[PDB]
Amino acid sequence: SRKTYTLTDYLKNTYRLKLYSLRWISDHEYLYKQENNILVFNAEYGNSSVFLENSTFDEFGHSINDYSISPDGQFILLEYNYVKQWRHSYTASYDIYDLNKRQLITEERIPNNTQWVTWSPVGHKLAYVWNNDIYVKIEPNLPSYRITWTGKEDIIYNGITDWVYEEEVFSAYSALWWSPNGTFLAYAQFNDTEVPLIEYSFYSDESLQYPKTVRVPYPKAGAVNPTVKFFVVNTDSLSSVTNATSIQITAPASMLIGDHYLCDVTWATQERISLQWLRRIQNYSVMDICDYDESSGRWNCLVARQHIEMSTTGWVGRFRPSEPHFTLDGNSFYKIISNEEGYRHICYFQIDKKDCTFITKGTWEVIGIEALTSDYLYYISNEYKGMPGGRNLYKIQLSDYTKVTCLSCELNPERCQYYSVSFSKEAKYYQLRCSGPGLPLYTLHSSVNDKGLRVLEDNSALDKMLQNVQMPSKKLDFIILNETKFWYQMILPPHFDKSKKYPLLLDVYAGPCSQKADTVFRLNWATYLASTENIIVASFDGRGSGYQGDKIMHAINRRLGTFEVEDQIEAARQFSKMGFVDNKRIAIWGWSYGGYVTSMVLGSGSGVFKCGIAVAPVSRWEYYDSVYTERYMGLPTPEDNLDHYRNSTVMSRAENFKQVEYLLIHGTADDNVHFQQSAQISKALVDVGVDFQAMWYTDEDHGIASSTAHQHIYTHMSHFIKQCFS
Amino acid sequence: SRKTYTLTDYLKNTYRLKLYSLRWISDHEYLYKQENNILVFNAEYGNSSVFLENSTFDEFGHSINDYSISPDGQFILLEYNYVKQWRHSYTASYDIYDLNKRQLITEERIPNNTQWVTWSPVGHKLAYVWNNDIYVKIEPNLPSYRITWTGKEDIIYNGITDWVYEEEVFSAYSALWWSPNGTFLAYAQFNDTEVPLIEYSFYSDESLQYPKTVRVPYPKAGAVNPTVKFFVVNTDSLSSVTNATSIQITAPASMLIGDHYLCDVTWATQERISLQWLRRIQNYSVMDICDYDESSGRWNCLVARQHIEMSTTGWVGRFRPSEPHFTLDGNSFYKIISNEEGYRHICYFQIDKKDCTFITKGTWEVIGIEALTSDYLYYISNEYKGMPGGRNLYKIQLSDYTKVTCLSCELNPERCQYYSVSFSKEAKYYQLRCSGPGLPLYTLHSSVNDKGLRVLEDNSALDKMLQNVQMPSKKLDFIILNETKFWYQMILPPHFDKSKKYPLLLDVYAGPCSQKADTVFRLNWATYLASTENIIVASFDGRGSGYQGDKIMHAINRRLGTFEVEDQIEAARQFSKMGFVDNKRIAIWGWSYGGYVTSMVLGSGSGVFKCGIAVAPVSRWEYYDSVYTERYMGLPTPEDNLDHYRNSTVMSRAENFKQVEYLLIHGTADDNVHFQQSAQISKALVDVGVDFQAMWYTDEDHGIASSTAHQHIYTHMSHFIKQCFS
Numbered sequence A, B: 001s002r003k004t005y006t007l008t009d010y011l012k013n014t015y016r017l018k019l020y021s022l023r024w025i026s027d028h029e030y031l032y033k034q035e036n037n038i039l040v041f042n043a044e045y046g047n048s049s050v051f052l053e054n055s056t057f058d059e060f061g062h063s064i065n066d067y068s069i070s071p072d073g074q075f076i077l078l079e080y081n082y083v084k085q086w087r088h089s090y091t092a093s094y095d096i097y098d099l100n101k102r103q104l105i106t107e108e109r110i111p112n113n114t115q116w117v118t119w120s121p122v123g124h125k126l127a128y129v130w131n132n133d134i135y136v137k138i139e140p141n142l143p144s145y146r147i148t149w150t151g152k153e154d155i156i157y158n159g160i161t162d163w164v165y166e167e168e169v170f171s172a173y174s175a176l177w178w179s180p181n182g183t184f185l186a187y188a189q190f191n192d193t194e195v196p197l198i199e200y201s202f203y204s205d206e207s208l209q210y211p212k213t214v215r216v217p218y219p220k221a222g223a224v225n226p227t228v229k230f231f232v233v234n235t236d237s238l239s240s241v242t243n244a245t246s247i248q249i250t251a252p253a254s255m256l257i258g259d260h261y262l263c264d265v266t267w268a269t270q271e272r273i274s275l276q277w278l279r280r281i282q283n284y285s286v287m288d289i290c291d292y293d294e295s296s297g298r299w300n301c302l303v304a305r306q307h308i309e310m311s312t313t314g315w316v317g318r319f320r321p322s323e324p325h326f327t328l329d330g331n332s333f334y335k336i337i338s339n340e341e342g343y344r345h346i347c348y349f350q351i352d353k354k355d356c357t358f359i360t361k362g363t364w365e366v367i368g369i370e371a372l373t374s375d376y377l378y379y380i381s382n383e384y385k386g387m388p389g390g391r392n393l394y395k396i397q398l399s400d401y402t403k404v405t406c407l408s409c410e411l412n413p414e415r416c417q418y419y420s421v422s423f424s425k426e427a428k429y430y431q432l433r434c435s436g437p438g439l440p441l442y443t444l445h446s447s448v449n450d451k452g453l454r455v456l457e458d459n460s461a462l463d464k465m466l467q468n469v470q471m472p473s474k475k476l477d478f479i480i481l482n483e484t485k486f487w488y489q490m491i492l493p494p495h496f497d498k499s500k501k502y503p504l505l506l507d508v509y510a511g512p513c514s515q516k517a518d519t520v521f522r523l524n525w526a527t528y529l530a531s532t533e534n535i536i537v538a539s540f541d542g543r544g545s546g547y548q549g550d551k552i553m554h555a556i557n558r559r560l561g562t563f564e565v566e567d568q569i570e571a572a573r574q575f576s577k578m579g580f581v582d583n584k585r586i587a588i589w590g591w592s593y594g595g596y597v598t599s600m601v602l603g604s605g606s607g608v609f610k611c612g613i614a615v616a617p618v619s620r621w622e623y624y625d626s627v628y629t630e631r632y633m634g635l636p637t638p639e640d641n642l643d644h645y646r647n648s649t650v651m652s653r654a655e656n657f658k659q660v661e662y663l664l665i666h667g668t669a670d671d672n673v674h675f676q677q678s679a680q681i682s683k684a685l686v687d688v689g690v691d692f693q694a695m696w697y698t699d700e701d702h703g704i705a706s707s708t709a710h711q712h713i714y715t716h717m718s719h720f721i722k723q724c725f726s
């Protein structure tokens, strides 16, 4: 029949997925941007009006890469001169457009090279970070109030995170949190003074005669970590003559005794904020609930109002302690914590009572709490059909935990088994986002009866294009290893014949709490391999995997590079025995943690794999950052876990690579998994006399995502796999 | 028949070449070291005695990597703790052994981390450099006299060269010159104050948590160059209380007018020293002859005693102005300079007369002046058989230039056509070193009648081993391009059949004044390719090549990356038309300048080559050092040669690589041709969407010569070529 999904289709994105990204501005309306203008929609009836015409900025004279409308609907923040930094961080120039007077504000404009900017939750106040210091604008056209004066490049960070906090704890560059009505602005300050610097060359454009050396405060495992302080300022009590006063919230003592981290900040009410702290040994965390003292001006966090969250089997939380969701009065809150059986469920706390009450239970987990009304609590879980890789929205009656209703399970069970949700301001409405196994489907619903209002986007256009192409199919199932079931997925070539023996590629990540076997619909490299090259692309979730309880997830505690790699080998072993797999052509590849596992597997001497590809792999844990590495490995000291740190390197397995074909790939400007990691792998291979293939990508970082580098790497990897299988 | 010369034979050196490295200690005796002890030989009769037993240092407690006996025969300098720096530089620890009292000197020992050490030409005085300062020891066991106090790491160098002077002008780390009888010690001082630093990462052993950044003063084309000063000190007029006085010799004015270099220093007599200076635009050089002023204590260089050496067609000298050879009284000297016809011959100068007299002439060149007696001048040239790739020793009667006798041409014309020589102290005897086309042959001769005394080493052992192996043959011939003949060589597979079509590999360097077609016997990678893989490995000397006159050598003046690469393509074109070449399988490879030419050829769009390998290539001249690059390219300024600098990059030819298979290789710690050069090539290829192969070598420098890296790179290159040809 017709054509197949080719590499060019993947690299040129010939088959595009349609989305419906909306932004709720109230409990009844949302903004829906288009290639040109922004419309405002009425959720109840579906009618719309133009919020702001596309031409409006025809002669702005700058390429605008993003807008941000004040909660007010009164102003629009125009972002341009975007310059990316790390995974989330970047700098840019900003201009504010007054939607009232339809005029661009030209006075007291936000400075260029601004690091972060954000409106207050309600009015139109602005808070931004420039040169590592925090500034606040009460009105768009008025002078800014400086909040901090200690900002110093690569040393003191006010309102923004340093490298490790951005990548590993807040997943954001922002380190400031406005109170509910905008009165208070809370923020964190990081000090990297004694944090060592990772240094690497950046070659830049051909015209640069001498390469530049990039240096960034980056704490590797066991190194000196940055320290943190927390402050809260009243933005209603600032002059312009007085240097605003930031009230610091310190402790707790159980944390100050040694190295620790600030891992969460969540406002409870107008005058109550909650903070979660984590010891460097991420076995123990403490939440403080602090109240603003009217006549004192300071903040007090009553003990007895603090809650301890610890683990005896591993670290706390999936990647960090979960965030609390406070009831309206801020006197109680709900939060996801691990069960006595090791399953993460919603517990209900009274702010001044130590024991909480689990409101959900079972051998499945709550992925996240999505909304809270005085009536119900909405959450996503993988309870349905007992499929860990499925996601559905549920609502539980606060008055009777016995009454739990699934809101998405039955909408279209064939096409939709993986959902995410987006509620309006007061949860009056919600958009459901189906991402698989069928084509993504976006719909709108009203919470009063959970009635489906209408279909927002059904990807019918893409559906029409795909019926003329031989697409692969996807199989989601499980195998059983000593009592326990472990899930896997396989992207199967079109016209799959179980009597035929296909070459198999094991797509791996396998990091702690990861999930590579799910019901999500994807159009990627694997789609091409299966559709055009007739390769089966499988993924397996073994020990260390997430969303299935702690017995499985914590199985690799203090032992990275053991069970999770062994299980990938075992999975391949079972696959090669299902009947439709050519055991002479089994390969493996992964990126980052997956590059590490791929390398550990290729050097295991198992002999199960013929070839493999490792992209930006970790090679030895002492080279990776402290927050992530130590969370699972503890400290690289003789008193703690040094022996296993030394036993789990890729380099020690070099000799075993004589039995496989290896392709090692790494971006030279990788600020995350340093090129150093692959540099040591190659040196060990050379020292043992093992031949292999390699490819460096000049000035590319961890994503090797530039348009040209992206196309080049996948093209290179395609040739390698085909050669290995042909 | 028997076996072939395999890759393992090459990498494991199974067929070893024997040498006969002797060291003349007088006009009648020489030292000949063995794996264990050092013998002393009488040149006249050939008898010997043990100079010093191997066991002598059984319990020295340190691995001695080299010895140096004082001209005195009284002391022995023991070098250990050797730590290599650049191509010639290194540091080490030294101990002095008294051969008189058979005792190790334990007092006032030479400090560790010493940068350079050397005995005086006669007695047993010592001069060494430590921490960039010069020290002198009049007696081995006595305290040292400090000569300089300005030494500062990476900034001020006294007695030693900085990076660029070591690599490009003196081909040595040493920058000190003793006078004939040891009375004076002349030295250069380099100042790298404003020289930019090249910075690159060094990963070191796996245990290093953070990579270190190496930084070295390195002036790239057009950058700020180091400056130089010259001094002479009387080592007989030093106290121990007074800070010795160094007399500075400055100028000439024609040099001080702008950037310049010190390019040669040669003592003429006990009280006369000659210095050669070169302008940054290496078109003009000046020699000064300076005399010690008895009653003044200073040195005066009379104008009228200085000689100008310039070129209108190119730069001066092969790589720099040649060194003079002074007659006994220092009132005249001989030196190689370019003819009016462009051929380098020996000219005879009167120190105070401007015009010199050529004593040799013809369409061939004098390679070097080897010895001078009041009777004859001994020199090596390629006059014999008009073969530019041949080398023979000649002697010319100073009383009658008409009388020129070849001393090696007829010794064994079949086996020996390439000689180097080593004369005794007063040229009473000389050792001839035959290096090809047959097995290397070492012999001894007496100068009075040029009688052959005996054979020192004939490599009969290796000869016996090779008769049991199918070795390739070597063809040295020429082709004709518009009137001029250009030589080439081909390593031919055993049992070569001219009726058969063989794949061909073009081994290239092609840098200015290079010569890749000669009569030298070699056992290398090419030997394996021809013997075992049946590949013809050819090399061609086109425009820019040396030893054939300036019309050819200066053809690429101010135009690197043009005629020398075009000629390699043309050569391949003619080879592919000789009848025994498969024009579908022609490849090209080179290292450093050869990597540049290989890359320029592969990107020429000629289509003549199927594949190629570039190792540590230059990619754009602005990235290479100033002394070398500018010598041929001038300055990268709009007023000078910037346009061609920009027109001769490899990056601008990226698009053309779509038609070839390319392998790019580079050591990450290459301090000479920076990794940066290959980093920019790969980026340009990626940006154009061209697939290629790559291999970086962690912590390897320009030689990629570590035992493991050496074996690995050739093994990798072997797979690539075989795949390309199979």
Ligand SMILES: *C(N)[C@@H]1CCCN1C(=O)[C@@H]1CC[C@H](CNC(=O)Nc2ccc(C(=O)OC)cc2)N1
Pocket: B167, B168, B509, B511, B514, B515, B516, B591, B592, B593, B594, B618, B624, B628, B672, B673
């Ligand atoms: C690579 N060879 C780089 C690129 C351009 C200049 N360069 C150097 O290393 C310069 C050349 C002169 C000086 C000292 N090094 C050498 O002289 N190296 C050398 C290498 C290869 C040959 C050869 O193949 O001769 C037939 C000769 C000399 N740094």
